[PDB]
Ligand binder design. Structure first.
Ligand code: MTA
Ligand code: CL
Lengths: 625, 310
């Protein structure tokens, strides 16, 4: 249900303790690998030659035990960033030793604190440990939502707390993390353990951490209200947060003595399980998108490639989209053939990009509903799918359906069409080259001819996600430009992320394109107003299309076609994250460019600073014509 | 070994305190090996320690012992890593030590303790950064102070006042306290903010005077009236862990450090004695009540040294 651990700074017997925590329901333990008061000297006799053992043995637990159930904790005395040489040297050596021992034991994670501003030497030292051996043992950074110093009680007469607004100042805790992380070049092994305090900060501060790499929420017993019956409980507002964090799937930790003394530690844990099971069920979308959270996939090119069987299978498992397609045609027919003309007028209906025939099937359900006569073509270039179609037409569709196995740009039609219908649309609307495909097929439309869809429009929104920025960076491949990853779109269920501004339209296309000089090449400038301090990693993409009149589809989260899981959002990354400040505008520029051969996007951020132009000349990414 | 008195004393002896009668209270923890816990002991003979064979009484605590205090002649108050403060009662014939009260009120290790001029109340320093006010009699916590922004290092009660105690923390703050004022805590430091405060000792005679030892091994001389640091000396190569005043007319100040050295200082901060006898971390100091010129030093080396001060 909810993975959870118990932090403790005192373990007499690792044997005794571990059973207890597990008895109470704790999945894991966070504890010191060396005694937290046990301070060591590494340079000065006599205490340098202190006789061993320097801690308890690995033998005391199974390798399996260490691998699964223990999270190490840096001893609190270790202050690499001390003003005093002797302490800095000794903490350098001690941090290495402790961290080295974590890895000796194969511990899955190790807790280090960001409890002050300057953590430069600490980062330096960890970075060294990381570049020593190849391990996967995560490092959890302990950072508070609120600095201990801005949570003191105002009981110091000579040095009172400043009750002035500190917008920038109450985000200090994030700057701590941001810097440490940046010094460490965004190692995927360095994540956040976010200590939640008594008093939650201003929502803006919590808004910072949305797209940060948080593996842990730390909850001290100190933040627990007591219900009438003496149960441990949390503020209404703390609940909203815990609900948010469950969505981000984090591992809730518990620190502090059992204040609710007339109860087991299970009391605390029970509340979380209680909140968890009380959360709304996963919707249909949420079920489909289960494992694909922040999973980067290459965008499909069903023009230059032929889609697999199972690709078409799943994509047809979207009932809503075909309902919408059926309805658009239903309405178009009634609007094209008067009831007096019903049996005198049969309509020429050409599906351009048929795949395995759900749209053809819906074209059929449209006629039976609207009771008019329809002549069917199924044009499809993937000759594998054409196999499924000609197997259907033979068995069920009969001579109503002429299967045409070709490119719609090739096929010389026996007759012009009343209606053309297509599902040639990517997550950025036009990224599969729906415009070029339907431009080439438009000659075989009657002058009064309709296209479904009549129109589509891309939208773009600036986002912050150090997690997706890291995931993209990870997509480097040998024998290719070391930064090709950054110059290409990815379809992804954006999850651990922060949208910095609501979407704006990017590119629009209308079919038929009666334009005298049709050009699908585009240059667009966008200005996105941002109102928190944040760091831009890339631009999300969605789309909206008009099938016919009021019938439409959208993956735009505000206008989202509900239940429709057929398209995940698109991501245009940038090579270098761009610091943005409250007030500032993010200006992005997008170009759609074409060849005879290929179509591509280029993009640049022109404010608040300039980025390098991305995918220049389609060098890193193109779409085949 | 007397009754309820185990064989072994944990190697890491954190506390060395002499009663009026010249009895020796030793608390010690296990900072190494499989069992990470603490002990309590009694030496009705001074020089019998550290051998448990000659000890008059002893017991074992659940957890280690970061700091311990006398509560007159019978009671002993503990700073337990467990995050609990606990009181144990001494025997009528003083043969045994039994736990009076054990309350887990701190959320992290309990680092320091001192008992009030009354001896009916005490104050605790924890790495949860909080300082608490205790009713020894009622065994509860009337006040919680979160003055500091870092873990609390030392809490020293005023000798002569039940409302006044010093506190030093890693937040580079030293606090003078008066429970009476609505903002009790009052920040006191030298001219410029400096190295961290590590050790606190109130002057026995002049209740306007205290001393602090920094992490840099500079002991400092503090007058609250002018609230300005008059004098400081470079005594120790390392952090000053402890500062103890002799019972003498004009007292002597004992300076102990992680440099595994001890010195005794005159009233003008001038070092009369330098002892390298300890081979590990010098934790605590008490002066011989009987022979006032004798000093009793413990450390993690499990060594108990007795000192002839010039
Ligand atoms: C339903 S995903 C789009 C479908 O249309 C087909 N398609 C895409 N472009 C063309 C084209 N130019 N001519 C014919 N079929 C196409 C693809 O092979 C795929 O099955
Ligand atoms: Cl998808």
């Amino acid at each position: 249900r909810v993975s959870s651990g118990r932090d403790l700074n005192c373990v007499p017997e690792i044997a005794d303790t571990l059973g207890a925590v597990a008895k109470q329901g704790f999945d894991f333990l966070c504890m010191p690998v060396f005694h937290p008061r046990f301070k060591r000297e590494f340079i000065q006799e006599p205490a340098k030659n202190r006789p061993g053992p320097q801690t308890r043995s690995d033998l005391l637990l199974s390798g399996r035990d260490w691998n699964t159930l223990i999270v190490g904790k840096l001893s609190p005395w270790i202050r690499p960033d001390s003003k005093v040489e002797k302490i800095r040297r000794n903490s350098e050596a001690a941090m290495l030793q402790e961290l080295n021992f974590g890895a000796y034991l194969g511990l899955p994670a190790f807790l280090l604190p960001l409890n002050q501003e300057d953590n430069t030497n600490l980062a330096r030292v960890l970075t060294n440990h990381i570049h020593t051996g190849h391990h996967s043992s995560m490092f959890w950074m302990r950072v508070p939502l609120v600095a201990p110093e801005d949570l003191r009680d105002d009981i110091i007469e000579n040095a009172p707390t400043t009750h002035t607004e500190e917008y920038s100042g109450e985000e200090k805790t994030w700057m701590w993390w941001h810097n440490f992380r940046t010094l460490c070049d965004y190692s995927k092994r360095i994540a956040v353990a976010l200590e939640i305090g008594a008093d939650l900060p201003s929502n803006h501060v919590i808004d910072r951490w949305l797209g940060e790499p948080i593996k842990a929420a730390i909850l001290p017993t100190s933040i627990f209200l007591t219900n009438k019956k003496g149960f441990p409980v949390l503020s209404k507002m703390h609940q909203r947060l815990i609900f948010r964090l469950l969505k981000l799937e984090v591992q809730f930790i518990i620190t502090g003595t059992n204040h609710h003394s007339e109860k087991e530690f299970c009391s605390y844990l029970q509340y979380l399980e209680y909140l968890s099971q009380n959360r709304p069920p996963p919707n249909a979308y949420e079920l489909f998108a289960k494992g694909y959270e922040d999973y980067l996939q290459s965008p499909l090119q069903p023009l230059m490639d032929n889609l697999e069987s199972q690709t078409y299978e799943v994509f047809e498992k979207d009932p809503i989209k075909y309902s919408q397609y059926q309805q658009a045609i239903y309405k178009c027919l009634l609007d094209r053939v008067p009831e007096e003309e019903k049996d005198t007028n049969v309509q020429v209906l050409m599906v351009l990009g048929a795949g395995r025939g759900p749209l053809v099937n819906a074209s059929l359900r449209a006629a039976k509903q609207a009771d008019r006569r329809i002549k069917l073509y199924a044009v499809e270039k993937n000759p594998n799918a054409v196999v499924t179609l000609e197997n259907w037409q033979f068995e069920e569709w009969g001579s109503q359906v002429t299967v045409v196995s070709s490119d719609m740009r090739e096929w010389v039609a026996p007759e012009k069409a009343d209606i053309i219908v297509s599902e040639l649309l990517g997550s950025f609307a036009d990224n599969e080259l729906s415009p070029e495909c339907l431009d080439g097929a438009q000659h075989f439309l009657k002058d009064d001819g309709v296209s479904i869809p009549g129109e589509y429009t891309s939208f773009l929104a600036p986002i912050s996600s150090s997690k997706l920025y890291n995931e993209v960076r990870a997509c480097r491949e040998k024998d290719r430009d070391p930064e090709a990853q950054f110059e290409m779109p990815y379809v992804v269920r954006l999850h651990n992320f922060h949208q910095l501004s609501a979407p704006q339209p990017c590119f629009t296309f209308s079919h038929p394109n009666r334009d005298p000089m049709i050009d699908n090449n585009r240059y667009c400038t966008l200005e996105f107003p941002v109102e928190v301090n944040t760091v831009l990693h890339g631009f999300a993409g969605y789309f909206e299309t008009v099938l016919y009149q009021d019938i439409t589809l959208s993956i735009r989260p505000e206008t989202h076609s509900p239940g429709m899981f057929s398209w995940f959002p698109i991501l245009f990354p940038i090579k270098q994250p761009i610091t943005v400040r409250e007030g500032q505008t993010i200006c992005v520029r997008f170009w759609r460019c074409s060849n005879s051969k290929k179509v591509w996007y280029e993009w640049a951020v022109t404010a608040p600073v300039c980025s390098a132009i991305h995918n220049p000349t389609g060098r890193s990414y193109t779409i085949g014509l | 070994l007397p009754p309820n008195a185990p064989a072994c004393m944990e190697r890491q002896l954190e506390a060395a305190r002499y009663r009026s009668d010249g009895a020796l209270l030793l608390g010690a923890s296990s900072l190494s090996g499989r069992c990470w816990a603490g002990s309590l002991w009694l030496f009705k003979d001074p020089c019998a320690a550290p051998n448990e064979g000659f000890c008059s009484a002893g017991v074992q605590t659940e957890a280690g012992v970061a700091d311990l205090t006398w509560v007159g002649e019978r009671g002993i108050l503990v700073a337990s890593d467990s995050g609990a403060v606990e009181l144990w009662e001494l025997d009528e014939n003083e043969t045994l030590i039994v736990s009076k009260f054990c309350k887990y009120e701190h959320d992290d290790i309990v680092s320091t303790v001192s008992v009030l001029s009354s001896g009916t109340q005490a104050v605790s320093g924890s790495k949860d950064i909080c300082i608490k006010v205790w009713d020894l009699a009622q065994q509860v916590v009337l006040s919680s102070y979160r003055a500091h922004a870092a873990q609390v290092t030392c809490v020293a009660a005023s000798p002569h006042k039940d409302s006044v105690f010093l506190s030093c923390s890693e937040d580079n703050r030293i606090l003078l306290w008066d429970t009476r004022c609505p903002k009790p805590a009052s920040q006191i430091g030298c001219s410029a903010p400096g190295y961290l405060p590590t050790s606190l000792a109130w002057h026995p005679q002049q209740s306007e005077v205290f001393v602090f030892g920094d992490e840099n091994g500079t002991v400092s001389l503090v007058d609250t009236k002018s609230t300005s640091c008059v004098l400081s000396s470079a005594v120790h190569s390392q952090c000053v862990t402890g500062l103890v005043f002799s019972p003498h007319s004009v007292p002597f100040l004992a300076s102990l450090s992680e440099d595994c050295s001890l010195a005794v200082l005159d009233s003008s901060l001038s070092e009369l004695f330098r002892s390298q006898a300890h081979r590990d971390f010098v934790r605590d100091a008490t002066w011989s009540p009987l022979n006032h010129s004798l000093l009793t030093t413990v450390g993690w080396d499990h060594q108990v040294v007795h000192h002839v001060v010039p």
